[PDB]
Design a binder for these strands. Structure first.
Ligand SMILES: [Mg+2]
Ligand SMILES: [Mg+2]
Ligand SMILES: [Mg+2]
Ligand SMILES: [Mg+2]
Ligand SMILES: [Mg+2]
Ligand SMILES: [Mg+2]
Ligand SMILES: [Mg+2]
Ligand SMILES: [Mg+2]
Ligand SMILES: [Mg+2]
Ligand SMILES: [Mg+2]
Ligand SMILES: [Mg+2]
Ligand SMILES: [Mg+2]
Ligand SMILES: [Mg+2]
Ligand SMILES: [Mg+2]
Ligand SMILES: [Mg+2]
Lengths: 252, 234, 118, 68
RNA sequence: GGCGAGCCCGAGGGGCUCUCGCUUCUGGCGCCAAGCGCCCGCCCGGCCGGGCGCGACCCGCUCCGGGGACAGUGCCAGGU
RNA sequence: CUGUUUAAUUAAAACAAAGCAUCGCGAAGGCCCGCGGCGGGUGUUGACGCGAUGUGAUUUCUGCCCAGUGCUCUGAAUGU
RNA sequence: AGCGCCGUUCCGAAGGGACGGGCGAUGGCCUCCGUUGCCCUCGGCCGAUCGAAAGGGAGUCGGGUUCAGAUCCCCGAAUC
């Protein structure tokens, strides 16, 4: 009869993201004439650590092509850039690490990251630390571009959206074991209040469909369909196949 | 003269900043501007019924001005001179002791109701209509009624311009009923050109369908496609 | 007519000054906090008399709505004496007590002898 | 006069000449606020048969409600 | 517009078809115009103080893109 | 293991823990809040991320059963 | 339905102020300046407002004084 923990997550009362010490949203520059009919050069001031994120944030200063003012943007620092390196943003920019340019111009097999789903989405895909997307196809007519995302999915996107070249800095971040609960607590304290993660079979039937019984067992098939109501989707959600995997999943 | 040199500024991609341009095509207009602007584009895109296509097709700048100069002689009598003539009437009546010392002056009739009650009884020699009316339904029925009654009807541009003669802000229609003996010929000379333009072509106007015009950005692309296809066929 | 910026703002229009055809109130109200209503009565306590001769300052129980400038003006208008400074405090009972220091040329003893307190 | 004509024309509001006008006016009113002031009634005959007279003191408001 | 590249015909040249302008060795600066051609009032055909255009091209019916008669919305019906 | 636990009968073998596995989701999305809006949390987020479960330092082991109950996928050949 | 609620930059004509120049009027010893009305040019709020007697926040110290006050009152010495 009581709302479960996974159901209380959507209320946003105490489960809000700790966004106090966040430096800024990681987004690219706005598409304009100086970007679609040439390129502009900017200077990287410094890279900083964003709490709750493994990818560093590089501050880049560009010169406004219309007003006398310097524009500061926060990009995702690709691995292999240093303070003082000139970063070029535009259509006819040279293919180098750090420079952003539309995917319709780069050749096949280009390892890029921080791209956009739609032209103007301003850097939404492949933003985690050490991830990249691989361009595999091109279409001159009916402009489309096939990319392979870090999840292995091959998605077709527009040929006008941009992507910075290179892999995100901070790779291999998951190779280190947390090695104790204190480091996990300090990690999740900057992200959000979701760490304790009490098992469902430990509590009572009032707070979870799995709790109860004199023996700490589930009693019901953990595989639950997609049509289950709120507060009922627990355990595996529409598990098409369970158990230890045998090779590659190869699912589209 | 010794040192008067030129400083050519390069306004390209990244040499110098861009100067101040018109930017009228990209300025963010208010909501009441954006609503009243795209209404014309909608009227041009949608296939308007043949009952609206009667309007937006009016007299040229010559015959309309001629009709206005003709109507300027039979304008409705203003309130100032109305009070003047009503004050003079009671005086000259006691002076001369006459029944009707002033002949009824021929004047045009204003108002859609008056125009309709005149054309239904066949009392109007001519009808002139405005097209800047916002609710078109108050006017769509009039051209068919004049076609059925056989009277000459003509549409003109500007309800305010139609309006100024009647001394009011907005006037929909005006009916000519009585014309002087010396302007009868000038009126009959133009009713013929009005009949051959509107009355005799009523079937073609009713069968004509306007609108259905795409934007230039959508016409240029289809022109490119048809050119590339013609260059492939031959 | 050139639009230097793509942002449309409200045009600076003319605003007429408020010219009332008739006053909403017939006559202005009388200032109740006058010079005689600012101060009420001096204190005759031993602590107040100690400040008379040893400090050349007077003690006055005044209204709570009066500030230092109003107290100074009321004293100058009522007793025709100069004022150095005024220290006001709200008593725990709700009244306001003001220590008003006279100028060195004036003596508090003669002011006290002239106005009641000795 | 003409109000009878306008009434008998508005009665058949499923023809093309009336459907086009209704659709254009619905689109125009969709962009405006939920409540605003129409300076003149869109249906003069319908306002007259309800009690609206063309004189000072009578106001016309246009307001939209959620269907359902 | 050739300070440019052309596949071609061709003696000078032409445009059937086209790429398009000028920021990539460097932790610097870059705005509120130089010039040119005209229009006024003041010093006898001069100085000073101002105005317009080109610089910075023209025309047009959506601010620019991506979907789109679908998605979503209201009502009803059947599953869970 | 350190840590937490029934204020006022329990301090534990219980809970939690790193670690080990599995499931859904490429944003017109996944999991939820909400009487209402293309309203809100995750999200100043983008698969080294988010959301939902099981087991519970390290080492070695992870046996056999899809019949049933659950989950998932397919062809308007095929019944209701 | 509604007391109203969600929403805080979203779908808003959401800058009422100033540097300077020009026209016009007014006042002070109309020599010279201070204002008012109008015109031109320029001017992103990161959206009103509230939110800390431990956060940020310019500037007072020494001696003496009462039955109850002290960086507050007096003397003397400074400062914003
Ligand atoms: Mg647990
Ligand atoms: Mg239990
Ligand atoms: Mg239950
Ligand atoms: Mg059992
Ligand atoms: Mg009115
Ligand atoms: Mg569009
Ligand atoms: Mg606890
Ligand atoms: Mg105990
Ligand atoms: Mg969401
Ligand atoms: Mg273990
Ligand atoms: Mg087993
Ligand atoms: Mg099976
Ligand atoms: Mg405050
Ligand atoms: Mg002291
Ligand atoms: Mg004490």
């Amino acid at each position: 009869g009581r709302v479960i923990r996974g159901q209380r997550k959507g209320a946003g009362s105490v489960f809000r993201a700790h966004v106090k010490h966040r430096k800024g949203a990681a987004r690219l520059r706005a598409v304009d004439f100086a970007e679609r009919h040439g390129y502009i050069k900017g200077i990287v001031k410094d890279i900083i650590h964003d709490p709750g994120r493994g990818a560093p944030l590089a501050k880049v200063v560009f010169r406004d092509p219309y007003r006398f003012k310097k524009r500061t943007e926060l990009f995702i620092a690709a691995e292999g850039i240093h303070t003082g390196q000139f970063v070029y943003c535009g259509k006819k920019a040279q293919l180098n690490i750090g420079n952003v340019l539309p995917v319709g111009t780069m050749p096949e097999g280009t390892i890029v990251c921080c791209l956009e789903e739609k032209p103007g989405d301003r850097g939404k895909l492949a933003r985690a630390s050490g991830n990249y997307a691989t361009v595999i196809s091109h279409n001159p007519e009916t402009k489309k571009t096939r990319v392979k995302l870090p999840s292995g999915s091959k998605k077709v996107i527009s040929s006008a959206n941009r992507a910075v070249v290179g892999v995100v800095a901070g790779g291999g971040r998951i190779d280190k074991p947390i090695l104790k609960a204190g480091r996990a607590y300090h990690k999740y304290k900057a992200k959000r209040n979701c760490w304790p993660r009490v098992r469902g079979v430990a509590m009572n039937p009032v707070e979870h469909p799995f709790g109860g019984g004199n023996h700490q067992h589930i009693g019901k098939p953990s595989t639950i369909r997609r049509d289950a109501p709120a507060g009922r989707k627990v355990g595996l959600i529409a598990a098409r196949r369970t158990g230890r995997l045998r090779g590659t999943k190869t699912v589209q | 003269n010794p040192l008067f040199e030129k400083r050519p500024k390069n306004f390209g991609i990244g040499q110098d900043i861009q100067p101040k341009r018109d930017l009228t095509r990209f300025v963010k207009w208010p909501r009441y501007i954006r609503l009243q602007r795209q209404r014309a584009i909608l009227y041009k895109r949608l296939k308007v019924p043949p009952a609206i296509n009667q309007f937006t097709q009016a007299l040229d700048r010559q015959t309309a001005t001629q009709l206005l100069k003709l109507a300027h002689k039979y304008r409705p009598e203003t309130k100032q001179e109305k009070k003047q003539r009503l004050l003079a009437r009671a005086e000259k009546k006691a002076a001369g002791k006459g029944d009707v010392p002033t002949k009824r002056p021929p004047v045009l009739r204003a108002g859609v109701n008056t125009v309709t009650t005149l054309v239904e009884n066949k009392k109007a020699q001519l009808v002139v209509i405005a097209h800047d009316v916002d609710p078109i339904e108050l006017v769509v029925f009039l051209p068919a009624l004049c076609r059925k009654m056989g009277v000459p009807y003509c549409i003109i541009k500007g309800k305010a311009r139609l309006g100024h003669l009647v001394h009011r802000k907005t006037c929909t229609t005006v009916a000519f009923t009585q014309v002087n003996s010396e302007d009868k010929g000038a009126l009959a000379k133009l009713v013929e050109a009005i009949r051959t333009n509107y009355n005799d072509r009523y079937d073609e106007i009713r069968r004509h369908w306007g609108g259905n015009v795409l934007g230039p950005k959508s016409v240029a692309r289809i022109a490119k496609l048809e050119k590339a296809k013609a260059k492939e066929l031959a | 007519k050139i639009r230097t910026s793509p942002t449309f703002r409200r045009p600076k229009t003319l605003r007429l000054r408020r010219q009332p055809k008739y006053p909403r109130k017939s006559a202005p109200r009388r200032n109740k906090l006058d010079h005689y209503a600012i101060i009420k009565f001096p204190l005759t306590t031993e602590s107040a008399m100690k400040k008379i001769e040893d400090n050349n300052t007077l003690v006055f129980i005044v209204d709570v709505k009066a500030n230092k400038h109003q107290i100074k003006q009321a004293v100058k208008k009522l007793y025709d004496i100069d004022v150095a400074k005024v220290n006001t405090l709200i008593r725990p009972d709700g009244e306001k007590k003001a220590y008003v220091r006279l100028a060195p040329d004036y003596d508090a003893l003669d002011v006290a002898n002239k106005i009641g307190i000795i | 006069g003409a109000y009878k004509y306008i009434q008998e024309l508005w009665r058949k509001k499923q023809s093309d000449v009336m459907r086009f006008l209704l659709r254009v006016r619905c689109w125009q009113y969709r962009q405006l606020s939920a409540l605003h002031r129409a300076p003149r009634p869109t249906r003069p005959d319908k306002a007259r048969r309800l009690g609206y007279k063309a004189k000072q003191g009578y106001v016309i408001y246009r307001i939209r409600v959620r269907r359902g």
